[PDB]
């Protein structure tokens, strides 16, 4: 049971890491609006 | 291979870390957008 939850907290954290890849491509877009401001 | 398994966690943690980082920065420029408001 106690692997279990630790495969259920390790499931958690690769849904994290997705919306951190989310993130990161929310972050590339606000760059490029950045960029197309300053021109 | 538990052990590779678990080093690839930390990896991947390393990297929410630098997008945690980046994140930290655009929330920097944030601020500096509100500052700009303000004035």
């Known amino acids: 049971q106690n692997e279990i939850r630790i ?6 954290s690769t849904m ?3 919306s951190h890849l989310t993130a990161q491509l929310n972050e590339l877009k606000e ?5 197309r401001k300053r021109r």
């Open 7 to 12: 495969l259920q907290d390790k499931l958690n």
């Open 16 to 18: 994290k890491l997705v």
């Open 31 to 35: 760059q490029m609006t950045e960029q």
